[PDB]
Design an enzyme around this catalytic site. Structure first.
Site, PDB file in Angstrom:
ATOM      1  N   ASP A 134       0.392   9.020   2.264  1.00  0.00           N
ATOM      2  CA  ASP A 134      -0.537   7.934   2.573  1.00  0.00           C
ATOM      3  C   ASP A 134       0.122   6.725   3.238  1.00  0.00           C
ATOM      4  O   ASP A 134      -0.046   5.578   2.809  1.00  0.00           O
ATOM      5  CB  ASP A 134      -1.270   7.505   1.296  1.00  0.00           C
ATOM      6  CG  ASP A 134      -2.428   6.563   1.575  1.00  0.00           C
ATOM      7  OD1 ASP A 134      -3.053   6.687   2.653  1.00  0.00           O
ATOM      8  OD2 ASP A 134      -2.721   5.710   0.713  1.00  0.00           O
ATOM      9  N   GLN A 175       0.065  -1.373   5.292  1.00  0.00           N
ATOM     10  CA  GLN A 175       0.084  -2.076   4.013  1.00  0.00           C
ATOM     11  C   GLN A 175       1.198  -1.631   3.075  1.00  0.00           C
ATOM     12  O   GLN A 175       1.604  -2.402   2.206  1.00  0.00           O
ATOM     13  CB  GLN A 175      -1.261  -1.935   3.297  1.00  0.00           C
ATOM     14  CG  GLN A 175      -2.452  -2.459   4.084  1.00  0.00           C
ATOM     15  CD  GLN A 175      -3.150  -1.374   4.888  1.00  0.00           C
ATOM     16  OE1 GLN A 175      -2.583  -0.803   5.822  1.00  0.00           O
ATOM     17  NE2 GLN A 175      -4.397  -1.085   4.522  1.00  0.00           N
TER      18      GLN A 175
END
Ligand SMILES: CN(C)C[C@H](O)COc1ccc(Nc2cc(Nc3c(F)cccc3F)ncn2)cc1
Length: 278
Positions: free
Chosen positions: A117, A121
């Site tokens: 993932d 961020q």
């Protein structure tokens, strides 16, 4: 937990706080996530140490709750990109960050550990010009962004490979260069179709076995592929060549992190220091 004093909420797999170790005075990132298989997998990550991987300092399993204590970094790439939106991140820095992230991935992948993932961020930077991977392999141990998800995951492949991380990194590479997300889908099918509209609807020619994937539908619209000169200008040919290999549809044709490090694009890589406002 009495050994830690929360300072502020860093963000949201659980909430994350900037905290101070009451004993050592060390400032850390405290993540509040307990099954056993999880404890074992997490324990393994504690040994996965590399300069481009955010260090997992400690795993606290008390009161049947799990806390992960990570080394603290002051800023993430998403924030740096927003802060550099008007001028854009200098190419030498983009190249340095890409190179470092590929070193980190090469390390993890050599240990058969996938991130799964990657997104701006969870890519953290410091004043020294370093960038590090955060939240690594915890996927194996608000609205979730689909923008960096590899096509094989979207098509239902249950046993995907290290190639999914290369795809995500390719999307991030393009975003740093153009200052806009490459495939900003807001649903699984919108994400898949945005990819198809840019890279062309995949077929058996470019991706053997694609028509037999779980979520593949013969009814998918057939879009033609677009030229990278149009997708990521003004990236030079070395960069576009590398990006094209990181975005290959067939996971087996997609370039590995190790091979990417040897790509001509990095012949003149350097380590610039970013201008960070903390
Ligand atoms: C809304 N906005 C004002 C907030 C800031 O941009 C927020 O700015 C930030 C962003 C990152 C940090 N430092 C971290 C995060 C982390 N783990 C970690 C991660 F990086 C991503 C997801 C889960 C995690 F556990 N591990 C170590 N150091 C601090 C401040």
């Amino acid at each position: 937990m009495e050994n830690f004093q929360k300072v502020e909420k860093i963000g949201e797999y659980g909430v994350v706080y900037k905290a101070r170790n009451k004993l050592t005075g060390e400032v850390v990132a405290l993540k509040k996530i307990v099954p056993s298989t999880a404890i074992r997998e997490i324990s393994l990550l504690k040994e996965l140490n590399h300069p481009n991987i955010v260090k997992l300092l400690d795993v606290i399993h008390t009161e049947n709750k799990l806390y992960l204590v990570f080394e603290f970094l002051h800023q993430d790439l998403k924030k740096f990109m927003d802060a550099s939106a008007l001028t854009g991140i200098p190419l030498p820095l983009i190249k340095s960050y890409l190179f470092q992230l590929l070193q980190g991935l090469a390390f993890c992948h050599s240990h058969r550990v996938l991130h799964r993932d990657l997104k701006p961020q969870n890519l953290l930077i410091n004043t020294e010009g370093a960038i590090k991977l955060a939240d690594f392999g915890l996927a194996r141990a608000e609205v979730v962004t689909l923008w960096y998800r590899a096509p094989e995951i979207l098509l239902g492949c249950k046993y995907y490979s290290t190639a999914v991380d290369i795809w995500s990194l390719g999307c991030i590479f393009a975003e740093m260069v153009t200052r806009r997300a490459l495939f900003p889908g807001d649903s699984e099918i919108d994400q898949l179709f945005r990819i198809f509209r840019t890279l062309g609807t995949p077929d058996e020619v470019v991706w053997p076995g694609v028509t037999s994937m779980p979520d593949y539908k013969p009814s998918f619209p057939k879009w033609a592929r677009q030229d990278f000169s149009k997708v990521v200008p003004p990236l030079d040919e070395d960069g576009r060549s590398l990006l094209s290999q990181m975005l290959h549809y067939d996971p087996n044709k997609r370039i590995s992190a190790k091979a990417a490090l040897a790509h001509p694009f990095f012949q003149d890589v350097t380590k610039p220091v970013p201008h960070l406002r903390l």
